[PDB]
TrEMBL record, chains A, B, C, D:
Keywords: Ion channel, Ion transport, Ligand-gated ion channel, Membrane, Nucleotide-binding, Transmembrane, Transmembrane helix, Transport. 3',5'-cyclic AMP 1 binds at G352, E353, R362, T363, A364. 3',5'-cyclic GMP binds at G352, R362, T363. This is Transcriptional regulator, Crp/Fnr family. InterPro entries: CNG_cation_channel, cNMP-bd_CS, cNMP-bd_dom, cNMP-bd_dom_sf, K_chnl_dom, RmlC-like_jellyroll. Signal peptide: none annotated. The chain crosses the membrane at residues 3-19, 70-98, 118-143, 155-172, 184-208. 3',5'-cyclic AMP 3 binds at G352, M354. It comes from the Bacteria.
Length: 400, 400, 400, 400
């Protein structure tokens, strides 16, 4: 979109002015050579203040917002330079630099999504500090005694001084020699201390948030381990729990499915649940013929559970009541004595369907081959769901 | 209220003393010219210590509170200056400056609401640092060898030194030349390091809290996106969820209605719910004649839900049971084959009323035109509510 | 307890050694004058390593813990000073200073309750930095060329240099002149940068936690206000909600009773609930004769609710079901037309008792005079409680 | 595993290059003496870029990942040194140093578990800063005027300058004398300010997280104490609650069992619950003969509760319904008048079994000897469990 290109162009124009205005205040002879750009740049500025009125909600000129735009659109710089009027009034040429805050707001709004906000604020602060350093170096030159030194070396020395002061390094090889330079130095010292404190605070804020997920996982694991140590839990079970948390981190950054899915609204939660359990519940022979309404109601009630390697999901002879769907990993179905393996079931398969229709003991043992992500449906909830689908209840009773 | 103006006046008086007392300790000749203000200022102080006793709960003189007020109300400064007594005892003139902490407490209490507390602490620290810098410059002058330099240049040099030290820039063009100046320099170096660390910590605390809502939204979105990536969700559904979160941010800063309304007490929650659902439930033909008690009970149980563009709220033939109220956005009511559009419903309208009275299949499909903020009422909860209003139950049964 | 006094004495002894050992390494002549204290101090140290074995669980000598104690109990300093052996081996005299970490652990454990842990860590760091500054000044003197300067001025200059370096101020009036002094300066510069970064981090951590309750209240209020602004809530209701939050802050720091009471175990929660509702439920005529078991069961189920000024708690003719207990504030009981006031009820009184026994409409309107802290008991929960006390149910039915 | 040893070897090789390359750029004569190591080191690098392809998922050469590895595997350094080609093109020899970020990633991945991530980032930053300081000192030497000074003293002076600048101490005894040195100084000043801000931010982040559990406990206790102070709770009950929180901290760091056990999945939660309640529920005479299924169902529903010293768990004559299992601490069973002690029960014992079968009043009072960790089973939940085990219900009814 060309409007963003216009905003980038105005970024360039305001940077042009932030560079040129103090550098022209210290070197008046620089005015006329760059005059054809100045009229070009100022025109662009007068082009902007009516433009964004068509985008602010895609005319509150009396509000504090849009005040720096119009205040910085006045051709004060041209008049000040042309009139060669005295410096104490010439300083009003800087009023155009108030466009900087509006340009910062625009850049923040057009980079508010691709860039971390803390990093965006840090980068904006760094750019502002570089521009302020340029301005402060120009002021330092303006207070320096006249000399035959080339303008480039003068600017280099002033920028060296201002960087030495703002960074608080303070070599002191360049120091104020006059009372006005001393007052200016005091002001710049306070400003540099504030700017460097802002830099440090922004960096601290940025870096304190980097490992949020990993630090949350670590605090969770330490809490659990300390509590289990208090309860005198044996180290084997503690090792199994530690490796469970290792699995949870390496697979899904320690996030709980139960808590993540609550952050979605019901239509999106239903879409996600239908996506994850794709055809796994619509391939079950118990309710192949069921309507999609019953399928949706079943899908919304599946509870995620993770079983570790070798953990028993079902033991033969237990008065079980739950059916399980394998979302990831694999399980072995074993005899009641576990001396022989009836089957291996893998991702996309299911077991325990008999518990939903009958109330009989479990036919065979089920044991996880490794870390299995499974979904559990309780017969209590299955009956609750059947309570509102009499046709499906009749179908399943006929099957039973 | 004039009491706040009195507190501002005492702010001015304590700033007057914090400036004058060390500057008089270094320039005794400054005493008499400002004497008519001093008696004016000290009187104001003796006017204060009985005054706030009428406001402290709107007389605990033995408590640590109100101790700095009375301790700083003693006319020690006048006696010390008048007696021209020796400097080691003259330093007791500074006891009046203990009013500063009480004035800071007062300013914090009268600006505790309009101003962010972290920013308020930062500003108080900055003011304290400026006053301390003035005092330290006065001490530096007090340890300097006598000279014919004008008092203004002496103060400027001392303030330059103390600012250079406190900001930790340390040019070193002004350095202690005597052992007493060296001890003073060491003390001031430690104090300046502590003050600048306090400044940096306050700035870091302030800036780490700026984007709390945006950072919470970002961490939520990253958690959800990472989890959906683990579940191998298709990118179309991920895009729909991302645009849902974009809508949630751009409309309501990512806040959950369900969680915001829990932070209000029941009377205020009821007032808010009655305000939002204004006449939308009192215009429904199903219960036009119902009493306001039933209306309130219904209003408290409406559940907010957001549907994205093109999402199906109701599909024809479904065994639906919920009525929906459109709080924002618009929906289209479509035929069972969706090849024709029966109607468009907008903000303030409702659909699905038949499900509450009957138990019949849905007559027509309902699909969101865009992001719709809707309120859902389940027939289970509607029946729960009807259980306590037999007259309304009879009315609705007669309608059915 | 005298054991804490012993630990304070050993604090004094370890500070004595941390001062003396480097100062004796630079001034050997200081050894013999303080020898009678040294044997006194070292004896105290050899007295400690068997003592705390009786307190460590109120003998794991092979563990890393208690290793610095025994390692710092060896009389190495006495031998090094007496042998006047060469400096590269004389540096082993510093091994006694390893008592510092054990003394820091002891001080942290005996001040872990009266003092904020972050402030405790900051103070420990500051003390360690002062001791390290003393040691570094001694090293700087040890690398300085011999001179006739008095020892006091030499120490003052070295301490000035080390404070100037550690605080990163860096005047540079004292600088290394030799390669060994340059290497030492580099090491001390890195150490000072690390120490000052530690100071800044500790201060930032301390100050970022100061206003936790106030910042939580502010973020809550901003969230609620922003959400209500999105919902287009009228400014009058917003003002009422703002003043409700103001009341909540000024009374109880914004804490929710419902959430605070969940942080207590059941016996303590019951004790607190019995304390708050003291005789208010045991004075009700409905169940004066009830046993204390029923009283406890009733007391555990009272729900706190806050009503704002002028809010209607009960309106005449409503099909109400709740009884209310006034814990603070006062309410007015008014006629059905509100044109006359039947009564005013205050702290410790109750209203709405008829709703529990009968099912009749409310006899009169109840309206809050100001912010009232009330407790609500629902007839549904009252019936649940009566279900387990048949005698009390019979009593209340006889009353009805 | 030898692969980790290979990664450590490549750590050594990349450190070798990061040291040698700039030091050879400033001292070309250093090239040939270390040439037999260079060919040895570069070979190792060309050995790596095919190796990790077998481990990246235990070949995406077009991705940004693995780009620095191949870019840093080119023998550019050998050619640049052998060709003695001009310095502006010789600077390309540094391209090999891009191996540093890959080595940092590898070290982070192989130390991501034993080391706190914040501390790991801080240590990596410190190492990077030391290497950068070496490089910057080499650049400073490269811009220095030729002199007869020994290379060691030149390097020492350059390293002194760069450490003085990066730490922001800034003595200023060594300062740029030429415009190119001034530009280099400005760049290094900005880089050092950024690096020191990074150090401070990392330290602040690290130290702000140290006392997370203790600070959470303190904020909990302050919240509870403030709320109880508002409710005008008597100081005796407040003292009992404070000592309860002291017990909770000293035993289990203030963690709630109810919340810790929710962070485990159902199989691990069941394993932990079976471990804690080991034989305590399988020794009860009420259900000695019960199957392990009923035992598991009972075990999952035990609620933890802590009773303070002297607190009454059961009072004689109460219409109680709960059985209690002593996990830690001890209780006394006392007569109805409490004038005699029937028994003392300790860890691993139980009381209140009669309430589960009968509905009779409590036979005797039970009072905690000290802080008791107990588990409560309610008859309501016991009946819920019995509802699914008819055989056990028949057994317990026969016992009753
Ligand atoms: C990012 C935004 C940064 C803004 C800072 C820009 C400062 C530019 C100052 C140039 C002053 C100059 O260039 O000189 C001004 C006159 C001498 O002017 P002259 O050389 O014509 O005589 O000196 C003086 O007022 C001394 C310096 C006074 C600076 C006041 C700046 C106020 C900014 C707002
Ligand atoms: C609320 C406001 C309160 C204002 C209180 C003002 C008190 C001082 C007024 C006089 C003044 O302004 O005193 C200026 C002083 C020098 O005073 P003098 O020439 O009378 O000394 C005697 C010279 N003899 C010995 C050669 C004769 O010099 C100076 O600039 C001293 C510094 C002036 C204030 C700087 C504040 C910096 C902020 C932090
Ligand atoms: C914000 C609050 C700031 C407070 C700091 C105020 C410090 C004022 C010191 C003035 C000392 C002075 O002006 O001179 C004191 C005498 C020479 O006094 P003299 O010139 O009459 O001889 O020097 C000395 O004690 C050397 C300096 C000693 C400063 C002690 C300050 C204690 C503050 C509490
Ligand atoms: C809080 C804990 C603080 C501990 C720091 C204590 C440092 C004391 C150093 C005294 C060195 C000294 O006093 O001089 C040591 C010799 C010259 O010894 P000399 O004057 O007898 O010849 O110089 C040298 O090694 C140069 C300095 C070497 C310092 C190594 C300190 C190692 C600490 C662990
Ligand atoms: C993994 C470990 C890797 C070690 C790699 C070592 C590479 C350098 C070895 C040689 C050395 O050690 O080079 C010492 C250099 C001076 O070498 P040169 O006398 O041969 O120069 C030529 C002198 N000409 C022109 C008068 C003839 O001077 C120096 O101390 C240079 C600095 C030595 C290393 C400092 C590291 C600081 C840490 C950050
Ligand atoms: C951790 C990673 C650290 C990396 C920093 C390494 C910087 C090494 C610079 C050595 C420059 C040198 O040693 O000299 C380069 C020439 C003179 O080279 P010459 O003495 O042969 O004449 O001076 C110059 O370009 C002035 C210095 C320019 C440095 C550019 C470094 C770019 C790094 C990326
Ligand atoms: N031969 C088999 N092959 C595969 N799965 C089986 C086999 N026998 C039993 N199962 C599954 O093992 C489950 C154990 O619990 P159920 O008896 O409830 O339901 C059983 C089936 O889902
Ligand atoms: N012609 C129509 N115009 C507007 N709304 C309709 C029309 N026909 C059906 N509806 C609404 O569409 C809803 C679909 O669900 P119901 O059958 O429960 O209730 C239906 C009405 O609320
Ligand atoms: N004359 C009165 N004086 C005090 N309280 C009253 C009076 N009349 C009614 N009430 C109280 O007002 C309440 C309004 O609700 P109820 O009818 O449930 O119960 C009523 C009593 O608790
Ligand atoms: N003599 C006793 N010795 C040990 N425990 C007892 C004794 N008498 C009663 N109890 C226990 O005290 C409990 C008090 O509550 P119950 O009557 O429910 O169950 C009682 C038994 O568990």
């Amino acid at each position: 979109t060309y409007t963003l290109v216009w905003k980038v162009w105005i970024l360039a124009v305001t940077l042009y002015y932030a560079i040129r205005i103090p550098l022209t205040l210290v070197f008046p002879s620089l005015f006329s050579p760059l005059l054809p750009l100045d009229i070009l740049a100022s025109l662009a500025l007068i082009a902007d203040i009516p433009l964004d009125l068509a985008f602010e909600s895609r005319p509150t000129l009396l509000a504090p917002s849009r005040l720096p735009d119009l205040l910085a659109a006045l051709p004060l710089d041209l008049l000040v330079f042309a009139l060669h009027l005295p410096s104490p009034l010439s300083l009003l040429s800087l009023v155009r630099l108030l466009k900087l805050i509006s340009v910062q707001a625009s850049a923040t709004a057009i980079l508010s999504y691709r860039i971390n906000p803390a990093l965006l604020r840090l980068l904006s602060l760094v750019g502002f500090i570089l521009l302020a350093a340029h301005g402060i170096a120009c002021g330092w030159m303006s207070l320096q005694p006249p000399s035959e030194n080339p303008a480039g070396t003068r600017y280099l020395s002033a920028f060296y001084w201002t960087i030495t002061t703002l960074t608080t390094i303070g070599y002191g090889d360049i120091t104020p020699s006059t009372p006005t330079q001393t007052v200016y130095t005091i002001v710049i010292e306070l400003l540099g201390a504030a700017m460097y404190g802002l830099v440090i605070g922004n960096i601290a804020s940025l870096v304190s948030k980097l490992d949020a997920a990993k630090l949350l996982h670590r605090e969770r694991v330490e809490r659990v381990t300390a509590f289990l140590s208090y309860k005198r839990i044996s180290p084997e079970l503690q090792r199994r729990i530690i490796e469970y948390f290792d699995y949870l981190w390496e697979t899904r950054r320690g996030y709980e499915e139960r808590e993540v899915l609550k952050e979605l609204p019901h239509p999106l939660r239903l879409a996600v649940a239908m996506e994850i359990h794709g055809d796994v519940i619509e391939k079950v022979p118990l309710f192949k013929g069921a309507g999609e309404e019953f399928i949706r109601d079943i899908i919304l009630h599946l509870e995620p559970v993770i079983y570790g390697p070798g953990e028993y999901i079902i033991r033969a002879g237990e008065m079980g009541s739950d059916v399980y769907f394998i979302n990831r990993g694999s399980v072995e179905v074993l005899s009641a004595d576990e001396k022989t393996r009836y089957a291996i079931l893998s991702e996309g398969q299911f077991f325990g369907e008999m518990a939903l229709i009958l109330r009989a003991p479990r036919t065979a043992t089920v044991r996880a081959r490794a870390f299995c992500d499974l979904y559990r449906l309780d017969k209590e909830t299955f009956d609750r769901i059947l309570s509102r689908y009499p046709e499906i209840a009749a179908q399943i009773q006929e099957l039973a």
